[PDB]
Design a protein around this ligand. Structure first.
Ligand SMILES: Nc1nc2c(ncn2[C@@H]2O[C@H](COP(=O)(O)OP(=O)(O)O)[C@@H](O)[C@H]2O)c(=O)[nH]1
Ligand SMILES: Nc1nc2c(ncn2[C@@H]2O[C@H](COP(=O)(O)OP(=O)(O)O)[C@@H](O)[C@H]2O)c(=O)[nH]1
Lengths: 191, 297, 295, 179
């Protein structure tokens, strides 16, 4: 039986751990999540047949830049996440995340995943973004970056309301069935 | 780095000297502590495929990769909590303490128990709406004040206190956290680093009392780092407020409740880099201001 | 208990017994009631329990004792095996047995002690003999350990370095301490946290025993038994215990220890097969001195 | 989709942890084995359909009598193990282990699994047993004991040589899928 290893990357605090917990437990975690979601395996049904879906969370923080790629080997699909109400996390998709997974996993498909849809209509969130002369990322804006960065497609979800959450991993499984190729640890020797 | 010429009637200089000694030993006591490192090694290897682990084990840099992130986080936290004010902040803390209300007569144990219970009640709507929970927390506060009266504080006292402040949990729950947790966008110490620096905070509390260091400033620093360390699985907020309020009430100061909603997320270093985090001295200033704000009410 | 007030003692065994009585009397607080130890038992036990059963059992107050009972009974079993409390017959026998040990007046230098401990390890394993490079690497760790521990109180960090030095064939990134309870030929070992707790007690025991002038050959016997029974590290516990004990012996002028007889080794630790008679703390000392007197 | 929980019980030192490691890794552990094998999940293809096989080790020691049954919920098949060169462990199948799983899981099938086959013909092992006027457990003796205790069947394996090891878990899956 074929297994599907799905690795979730993206800036810190974009909701990677929460979207995994809300998807695997059907409950948005209330009060305090682990830094990295404990890697979990679920049997998803696609085409009438079972697939083992392996979900792997990562620490997006800069402090884990050396350790994080060691989880990338034998990855079938990446979820490059950004918060639709965090323009910096969106910028880091082009500036950091897509270059990272492309370096270690050149021929591995990835999806652009906009997280925290619900906050896009939150007045307090809109107000805070406006303070910095910023505004949420529209779906049209993210869809263009997905084509520019050769992403499979742009999907969107809200871990809190589960809106489109099931659809995100459905597209991740479909992208994973596009045959990929193995990964590299870059092999950056020191000293 | 020099404070020799500044007015000091709070023993802040003696406080800064404690922080300098603890800071100078932070690398050995935490970053070079093998229990801490073993924790980081095991947690990091859980996300790495076993084929990659066998491959990487032939590279001498592998151990540094497993532990670098964990060490940087603790260093980030230690930088946020280490008290090392500027010459301006030093004199500012001097003026701010003079604005605090301080009662001459120190309350008895029964009275301190009620006031610390009410301070927790003001923070939580659940404690107000649940009389049974408030009575349970009142007993834990009373037990902690009885065992710590006229006796040096110990981690066992804090373990019992924290357990007492978690009566709604259910049996069999781990006392300490089993993994690194994140609060909103904040980072906390690893479980082992939190245990290590929990005992250092206990030593810090005892030495500060023996050295006659200003209790209100002590309470501020203790509040920040306990929240930043987050040693226990649950009840770290309650526990920190009870310990701090004992330090304050033992000195005649009003009990502390909580910082402003705008200022709390600045106590810890964060995962979202856009959030400006407050320095240890800035936390002390806002703490003293909040404490003086309760003298107006 | 048993009275020693009337017995001949030129080894400070009375002081040794008093040290063990204090440690044993505080064993319950220092280990069994230690929350880091209980938390470890709680988390390991729950890993095997379905989440539905945990939620049900969290309503029963006895649940926490069920999670930790097994771990507590194992440590108590181990502490009972290592706690030195001899009978009046064993007391007098140990006194006579120590007089039969060879003791050189001139104590060897640091370089000589390094070589003798290296050879003592070589005789135990056929692998170290057939591999000169491995033997040279262990010689460096022993030298480093003897240099950092000369004329200074022993520390857990010195042992951590020593243990790491005695594990040169491991590969990078390996955990220093063991991550779970291990069993060796049906023997029981301390949990990882309880082994750390009691490793530090053994270090304090070694330093206190040297200050109180307690017979080093008896100290080394007890230290060998509990280090093996505790088994704190993922690997190299055997090599590490032999190095620490031989240091205690060579510092006193006694020959280095190698290993017990093949028939007696499995009796050191408590067993998983209850039919195996396990040796008491005093019986381990008696056999240790007898093996040392032969050398 | 469908998961199969297989719990391995039996006296301590009969080889439960080793037979699990030897079956999952195809290599008998030579180093110090863990007290309880970390619970393991494999998706087996034996038969026509894939099934997730959950292997769960237990602590056979008497010190864990209160905790051990908390792992039994949701079990699909038990492996009551004894060492064929340990008459006391064989006796404890009737005296302890079968009564235990029957008390907690009355309608759950179990297999009688004799472990450590290679020692049945070991002269030193036979000589040691003969000193205590004991002898290894023959398959006929265990087969009778399995039928008496209403076991599904008696199987035997050696974690060291892997002889019949793959068959032991095959029959456990068959026993769970077809009670
Ligand atoms: N409103 C909203 N908040 C979310 C959502 N997902 C995550 N969050 C919040 O974002 C913060 C950080 O989330 P986290 O899972 O730790 O993100 P990570 O650092 O990338 O793993 C937490 O406070 C969550 O409550 C969502 O879908 N909607
Ligand atoms: N010769 C032989 N020895 C075995 C076999 N299985 C286990 N052992 C040994 O029996 C001892 C106990 O094994 P273990 O897995 O720990 O038994 P457990 O306590 O039931 O888990 C170990 O020393 C093993 O090496 C086997 O099939 N053949």
């Amino acid at each position: 039986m074929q297994t599907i290893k799905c690795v979730v990357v993206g800036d810190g605090a974009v909701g990677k751990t929460c979207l995994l917990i809300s998807y695997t437990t059907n409950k948005f975690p209330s009060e305090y999540v682990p830094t990295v979601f404990d890697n979990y395996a679920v049997t998803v049904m696609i085409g009438g047949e079972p697939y083992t879906l392996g979900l792997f969370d990562t620490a997006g923080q800069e402090d884990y830049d050396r350790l994080r790629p060691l989880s990338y080997p034998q990855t079938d699909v990446f979820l490059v996440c950004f918060s639709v109400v965090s323009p910096s996390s969106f910028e880091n998709v082009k500036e950091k995340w897509v270059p990272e997974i492309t370096h270690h996993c050149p021929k591995t498909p990835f999806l652009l995943v906009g997280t925290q849809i619900d906050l896009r209509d939150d007045p307090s969130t809109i107000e805070k973004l406006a303070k910095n002369k910023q505004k949420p990322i529209t779906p049209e804006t993210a869809e263009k970056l997905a084509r520019d960065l050769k992403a499979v497609k742009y999907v969107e979800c809200s871990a809190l309301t589960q809106k489109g959450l099931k659809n995100v991993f459905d597209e991740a499984i479909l992208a994973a069935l596009e045959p990929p190729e193995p990964k590299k640890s870059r092999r950056c020797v020191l000293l | 780095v020099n404070y020799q010429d500044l007015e000091d009637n709070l023993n802040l200089k003696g406080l800064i000297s404690l922080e300098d000694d603890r800071n100078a030993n932070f690398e050995s006591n935490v970053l070079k502590n093998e229990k801490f490192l073993d924790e980081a090694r095991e947690i990091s290897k859980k996300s790495i495929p076993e084929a990659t682990v066998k491959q990487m084990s032939h590279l001498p840099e592998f151990d540094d990769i497993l532990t670098e992130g964990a060490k940087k986080v603790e260093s980030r936290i230690n930088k946020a909590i280490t008290f090392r004010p500027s010459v301006e902040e030093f004199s500012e803390i001097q003026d701010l303490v003079k604005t605090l209300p301080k009662t001459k007569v120190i309350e008895d144990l029964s009275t301190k128990t009620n006031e610390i219970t009410e301070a927790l009640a003001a923070t939580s709507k659940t404690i107000q709406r649940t009389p049974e929970l408030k009575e349970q927390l009142k007993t834990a506060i009373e037990d902690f004040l009885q065992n710590s009266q006229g006796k040096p504080l110990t981690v066992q006292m804090i373990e019992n206190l924290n357990h007492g402040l978690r009566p709604d949990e259910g049996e069999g729950r781990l006392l300490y956290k089993k993994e690194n947790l994140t609060k909103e966008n904040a980072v906390f110490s690893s479980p082992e680093a939190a245990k290590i620096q929990l005992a250092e905070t206990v030593d810090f509390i005892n030495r500060a009392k023996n050295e006659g260091i200003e209790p209100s400033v002590v309470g501020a620093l203790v509040y920040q780092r306990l929240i930043a360390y987050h040693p226990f699985a649950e009840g770290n907020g309650r526990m920190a407020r009870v310990i701090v309020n004992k330090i304050l009430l033992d000195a005649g100061y009003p009990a502390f409740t909580k910082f402003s909603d705008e200022f709390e997320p600045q106590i810890c270093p964060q995962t979202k880099a856009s959030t400006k985090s407050a320095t240890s001295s800035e936390v002390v200033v806002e703490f003293l201001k909040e404490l003086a704000k309760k003298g107006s009410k």
